[PDB]
Amino acid sequence: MSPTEAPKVRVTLFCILVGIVLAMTAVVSDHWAVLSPHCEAAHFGLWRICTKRGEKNCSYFSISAAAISVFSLGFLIMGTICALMAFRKKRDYLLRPASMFYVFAGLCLFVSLEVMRQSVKRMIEYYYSWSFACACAAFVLLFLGGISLLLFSLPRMPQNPWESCMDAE
């Protein structure tokens, strides 16, 4: 009850509940780039590429980011299964891996972010408004709500000569 029902571990776990959906806001919305030739204004994403002058023509062609963000979504889903099952049956050891997959799901958007930047750099201007700063707020959420959940579930630095990690109870 001490590492799983403390409020400092549930403020963090509710914070991941924000970043679980903001990284889902990014992975469906294709709004994190603006092609601006000057009409051929196109808005890039992972899955659909839509050129807007209504003449809303959304289609596909980017593959790297898409493939990389199967792992960012999937890892998060797997992480939840460790985290949803670690609040019951008095097991708290289980949470330790749940904090691993949220760092990974954090860092598998950050490849995605870097992968999407190259596409806009190789292809007329660039501007991101709606879903780069979404995912750069779900990167920084999942990457840092994962490391803090880790240190809020690893026991403590021992602080005394007698104490040891994995110390009884």
Swiss-Prot record:
Topological domain ranges for the Cytoplasmic compartment: 1-10, 88-92, 155-169
UniProt tissue specificity: Skeletal muscle (at protein level).
InterPro entries assigned: PMP22/EMP/MP20/Claudin, VDCC_g1su, VDCC_gsu
Topological category with respect to the lipid bilayer: Multi-pass membrane protein
Disulfide bonds: 50-58
Modifications made to the protein after synthesis: N-glycosylated.
Family: Belongs to the PMP-22/EMP/MP20 family. CACNG subfamily.
GO cellular component: L-type voltage-gated calcium channel complex; plasma membrane; sarcolemma; T-tubule
Compartment(s) where it occurs, according to its Swiss-Prot or TrEMBL record: Cell membrane, Sarcolemma
Assembly notes: Component of a calcium channel complex consisting of a pore-forming alpha subunit (CACNA1S) and the ancillary subunits CACNB1 or CACNB2, CACNG1 and CACNA2D1. The channel complex contains alpha, beta, gamma and delta subunits in a 1:1:1:1 ratio, i.e. it contains either CACNB1 or CACNB2.
GO biological process, any: calcium ion transmembrane transport
List of glycosylated residues: 57
Keyword line: Calcium, Calcium channel, Calcium transport, Cell membrane, Disulfide bond, Glycoprotein, Ion channel, Ion transport, Membrane, Transmembrane, Transmembrane helix, Transport, Voltage-gated channel
Topological domains, Extracellular: 114-129
Main location: membrane
Cross-referenced Gene3D superfamilies: 1.20.140.150
Biological role stated in the UniProt entry: Regulatory subunit of the voltage-gated calcium channel that gives rise to L-type calcium currents in skeletal muscle. Regulates channel inactivation kinetics.
GO MF terms, alphabetically ordered: calcium channel regulator activity; voltage-gated calcium channel activity
Pfam families per record: Claudin_2
Descriptive protein name: Voltage-dependent calcium channel gamma-1 subunit
